[PDB]
Ligand binder design. Structure first.
Ligand SMILES: N[C@@H](CCNC(=O)N1CCn2c(ccc2C(F)(F)F)C1)Cc1cc(F)c(F)cc1F
Ligand SMILES: N[C@@H](CCNC(=O)N1CCn2c(ccc2C(F)(F)F)C1)Cc1cc(F)c(F)cc1F
Lengths: 727, 725
């Protein structure tokens, strides 16, 4: 019978079904079926039509995305989507009235709008255009221009610059609505002295002269952007006077040097939490700012400040976690690393510096999902002591020793990886299963925890996969220096433990990474095991996350050392298991993985025959400040220049004579610039090392465009096949 | 015994010996031996020492180049050479006194100087710095700044901009000395509205942010640079008044539209020849400008203008040829294409429009080398009717039917390719042989044409090569449509005509190209034949030069058509000869050849298995105006846009599924921009064609840096070997 071919992955023959819902009330959500936006009731189960598929056939545009106002009165329509960076994009927007049946022609949202968002209650609109903020109380009324200083590539109002979008906020939006819709908090970013990265873009063959793309990009040690935080009142907006934005300044302990705004979370209607981080990211300060109703100013009390610091590494996983405030807003829950280095929920009092841990163990809390007056819902990797697993737990606020796992025993064989979506005030929740079996989407009630109905069970895919020879997934660990280190193997169908298989080491190994988990995936690895009979192994060594600060902080100020060595060591241990042809061991990676892959191939360990590095880092001085400095500090002789110069791929150029090497990079990569790969290629050419190259015209860090995605995975398979000697 | 390996080519194991000399007088030249600059007398044969090797041991710098003043008084010393483009470079210069023994410390020539040149007589210095011209009568005296308008990337005084350096003058210098040293003729280039080409340069690993390189570069149909010509008097230079440069303007027939200054040749002490060319390069006009001694102005007479035009193509081979004036300066000799399309010497009279051809036939004159009152010396491909041959001929000025070949019979088996260097007033000449045998350098006298002595015979190399199994070279023709088309083959040692060999088609095929000649070469082809037993074949199809305008002008307004088809057709004829394994035919090329290689592999002819394209053109709108427009006209719907859009490599993307393709490009290529290759790779990725890629960080159109040159040829050999199994 059939096997999982390359075309099955590239043309996406066997699709995983998802269930994408948005809660609007405490018992109602929305799902679109056959382009018909329906509203599903959780109480009874009866589904009503909210918007029919033929409503926008005469709209004249292909609707890219939609956003419905929380009061169910208006529907924002995104079209003409032009992707910028990872999360950022410019588009055109039209507002449609749901109360009537008319498209609003008056005072329309301008073309090339950067970001648009509704207020949490009602139908107020805040949008960023030309780096400036505009507010609209009614969808047909004129817009109140809040900011005036917005300038392209220089000043950013309501939106993040490149470095804040990618490395800090993980989004384009730098606007924050108050729970009522009274205040619009926003950040301002000044990129005046931030250096530009410049690269060519070639566009269509029609374009005669290549366009140079300039982006404000702070590399390691370079001049960072400055940030200012403002809050404006959306109600008292004069049609004859420019709106007054009250600036909140950072603490004096932060104003000493360079800093970042790394969190904005509203507590109540007049209480806002802010978190600041020093450029050397081992010190963090939280502010709790109240609104002085008489003066109209914002006051953050020094007796309300909370400090987060570490001497073993950086603060947070990638940044300090978000606080979760109780209804009154006098106390917040937050994930902090405890004295033993494990990340658990600490219960804070607004005025008291010391917090009380409500959870503890040799495991970690992933995220706080929902908070009621009775329960706090969180996800953790506690169940069976497996870091690669995710489960929903509930904790009693009146009794911290009463912990109930709501997902652990639902389908123990099929489901070990959970993420959850809660309704307003956490009345009903959707549990989404993602592995090791096929994805399972179920709806549940919080009141008595009964499984009401199965939303999606992927039985349609299950029927298809019975006809195909699928690979098996093994998740186990090995003991090194009295420590458990988890690995995962994609083993070929009919895996014979007595035979010798070729092994490909799938690599990321970044700070706080997890390549070994229980997730069910249909990727390139699936093809290589099912068709080419190759074991695709992944290993979480030192520096990987969800295992405590002892493991995660091991690679602190030492990027390109332990995490690189552990991947080599893992390969030795796999061949010692006896089913690995140690004459055919390969290694591949993307992004950070490409860097480790490159570092490994140049270590001279002789363990690996060949390797593929796709869009790799080659030198930490080439990558952005926020990321690099978080782990490596500053590249100055006074700080950590020694480890910066010692961790380059270029210095390990000679050892590449031992290996077959394929370097791949997109020419329009804004994230990891072609420069990185260009320095590697040059280094190898200098010492007479032969290698393989492949550039991708006008491709970014994802090489994600349909035709390029297919071409790269085709080209890589060909490289792997010839390295392993496969017809 | 041993074979010619890859390392023999890459490490240059077997070196060809050269003999590089510069004439200073009518009977004296200079050669440097063991770093000792000697002066060799042609009259007696006795060599004298001019400058010893230890003279500049305490100089403190590695001497990059030297230039000696004509009067033998001073020696210019180039150091700190920083290459810019093909011919252009910035350097530092010191002047050393030969009369005394002292380095001049007063009024030194500034650092980062673009170009420096002596006057033809004496020791006057003209140098270009920051795009401005400076004159120095004495090496120790202050400098007279002629131009003041010089601005980087905008205004060019005394130096050519990118497009003029590469495509027009074939040099960086835009300065022209008068025979005495009285006048300094110079050109000014305005690049104000010329568009910029922008690419990244990565430099050392230390450089944190890549530098963007901006170059004024006019692509096909884009805004061209404007040109202004000036002449200044070098004698009447006031130390208190800015020098007056007299502007010479172009004819009214040229000022109607865009034009180029394409030639500057001095006739006498007060007579200068200029040649102008329309943007549509099928019309040319020459001016003869005299100096009005009373007014101080320059006057070019309307009754002295000579017109060159063609309706079958472009004027000249790459540009209109240079005139060769007689001693009095009332008549000049020039190579013109005759009525049958063959390029021969036409004798012009300053006032008379019609010229008289002194040579004719089914062959072409290559270049006029020297002119005396008795003889004109020229090189032509006449001997035995071989276009790939070069021979020195002399013609009697009193009798045009009296032609003598001075080189034809010297060593007929060893020597068929000659270039010549003449002394002042052509009293003695050096003949340099370059093939098919080993290079032979001989000194001769013009008076009675006896071979005085052998300068270099490469017998040292001959001894080495007897121990090595060398490939043989065959130069023959094939007849297509009643026309001879010459090809050349690098055949493996002990070539068995009954066996089947793999064939690599070495391609250029550009307008006025010649890949088939008698030259002896030790290249990559030598390795592939000697070690890998591969026939490396080259074929001169339509559009190739030195065979008449019928052949050369065939690809007019049709680039990427006939010349591409003829390379495919040539491969058929080679396999028809029966010693070619038609299952293993490859094709490779550089520059224009890379474009043809790419076009061929995308023709779907199925003749070729694999191919390598190194720094190729992909679309003619991407390459510069002067070159592209010379052959293709303007890329406008009114002109020739149809042929522009039809000749792209991108449109032939689908057919690449049939072939293995290796695309190579240097990232810092100013000539053929990485854009060209980037558009190919994208096009193939779009239609799902798998290929092979290889970029080269901070490499130009030559990929000539030591480590990169070795790496590319290693990488290409590996690709060829696996394609041929
Ligand atoms: N830009 C970084 C981003 C790191 N990941 C990251 O910010 N997130 C992934 C998961 N995550 C995030 C915040 C909190 C988490 C979680 F807690 F781990 F889940 C966002 C990744 C990256 C690393 C390189 F080394 C590189 F070269 C490029 C590159 F994009
Ligand atoms: N720019 C061209 C230059 C071609 N050669 C050239 O102009 N000369 C060499 C021979 N020559 C010249 C004038 C007269 C002659 C001669 F008569 F052929 F000898 C100048 C080379 C080139 C062509 C391409 F198609 C391309 F893409 C890049 C490139 F550099």
């Amino acid at each position: 019978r059939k096997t999982y071919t390359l075309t099955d992955y590239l043309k996406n023959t066997y699709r995983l079904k998802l269930y994408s819902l948005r809660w609007i009330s405490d018992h109602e959500y929305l799902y679109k079926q056959e382009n018909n936006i329906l509203v599903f009731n959780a109480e009874y189960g009866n589904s009503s039509v909210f918007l029919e598929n033929s409503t926008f056939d005469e709209f004249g545009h292909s609707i890219n995305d939609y956003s419905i106002s929380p009061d169910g009165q208006f529907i924002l329509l995104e079209y003409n989507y032009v992707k910028q960076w990872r999360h950022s994009y410019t588009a055109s927007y039209d507002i449609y009235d749901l109360n009537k049946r008319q498209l609003i022609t008056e005072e329309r949202i301008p073309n090339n709008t950067q970001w648009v968002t509704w207020s949490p209650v009602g139908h107020k609109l805040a949008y960023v255009w030309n780096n400036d903020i505009y507010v609209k109380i009614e969808p047909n009324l004129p817009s109140y221009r809040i900011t005036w200083t917005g300038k392209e590539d220089i000043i950013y109002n309501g939106i993040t610059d490149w470095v804040y979008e990618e490395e800090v906020f993980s989004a384009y939006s730098a606007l924050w609505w108050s729970p009522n819709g009274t205040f619009l908090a926003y950040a301002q970013f000044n990129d005046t002295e931030v250096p530009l990265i410049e690269y060519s873009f070639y566009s269509d063959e029609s374009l005669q002269y290549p366009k140079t793309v300039r982006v404000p990009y702070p590399k390691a040690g370079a001049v960072n952007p400055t940030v200012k935080f403002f809050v404006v009142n959306t109600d008292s907006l004069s049609s004859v006077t420019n709106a007054t934005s009250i600036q909140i300044t950072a603490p004096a302990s932060m104003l000493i040097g360079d800093h970042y705004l790394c969190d904005v979370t509203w507590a109540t209607q007049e209480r806002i939490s802010l978190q600041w981080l020093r450029r050397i990211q081992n010190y963090s300060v939280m502010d709790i700012c109240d609104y002085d109703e008489s003066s109209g100013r914002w006051n953050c009390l020094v007796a309300r400040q909370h400090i987060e610091m570490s001497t073993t590494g950086w603060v947070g996983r990638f940044r300090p976690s978000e606080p979760h405030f109780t209804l009154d807003g006098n106390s917040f829950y937050k994930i902090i690393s405890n004295e033993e280095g494990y990340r658990h929920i600490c219960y804070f009092q607004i005025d008291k510096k010391d917090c009380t841990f409500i959870t503890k163990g040799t495991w970690e809390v992933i995220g706080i999902e929902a908070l009621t007056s009775d329960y706090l819902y969180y996800i953790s990797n506690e169940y069976k002591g497996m870091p690669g697993g995710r489960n929903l737990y509930k904790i009693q606020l009146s009794d911290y020793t009463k912990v109930t796992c709501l997902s652990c025993e639902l389908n123990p064989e099929r489901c070990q990886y959970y993420s959850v979506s809660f309704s307003k005030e956490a009345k009903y929740y959707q549990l989404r299963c993602s592995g090791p079996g096929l994805p399972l989407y179920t709806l549940h009630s919080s009141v008595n925890d009964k499984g009401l109905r199965v939303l999606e069970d992927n039985s349609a895919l299950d029927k298809m996969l019975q006809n195909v020879q699928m690979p098996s997934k093994k998740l186990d660990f090995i003991i090194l220096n009295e420590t458990k280190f988890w690995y995962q193997m994609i083993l070929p169908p009919h895996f014979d433990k007595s035979k010798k298989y070729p092994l490909l080491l799938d690599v990321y190994a970044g700070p706080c990474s997890q390549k070994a988990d229980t997730v069910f995936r249909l990727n390139w690895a699936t093809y290589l095991a099912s068709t080419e009979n190759i074991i695709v192994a992944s290993f979480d060594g030192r520096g990987s996350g969800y295992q405590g600060d002892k493991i995660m902080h091991a690679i602190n100020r030492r990027l390109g050392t332990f995490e690189v060595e552990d991947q080599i060591e893992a390969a030795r241990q796999f061949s010692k298991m006896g089913f690995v042809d140690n004459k055919r061991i390969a290694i591949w990676g993307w992004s950070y993985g490409g860097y480790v892959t490159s570092m490994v191939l140049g270590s001279g360990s002789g363990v690996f025959k060949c390797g593929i590095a796709v869009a790799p880092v080659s030198r930490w001085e080439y990558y952005d400040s926020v990321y690099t400095e978080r782990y490596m500090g500053l590249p100055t002789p006074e700080d950590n220049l020694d480890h910066y110069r010692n961790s380059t791929v270029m210095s390990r150029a000679e050892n590449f004579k031992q290996v077959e090497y394929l370097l791949i990079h997109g020419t329009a990569d804004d994230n990891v610039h072609f420069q990185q790969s260009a320095q590697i290629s040059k280094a190898l050419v200098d010492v007479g090392v032969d290698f393989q190259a492949m550039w991708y015209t006008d491709e970014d860090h994802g090489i994600a465009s349909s035709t390029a995605h297919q071409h790269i995975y085709t080209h890589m398979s060909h490289f792997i096949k010839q390295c392993f000697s496969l017809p």
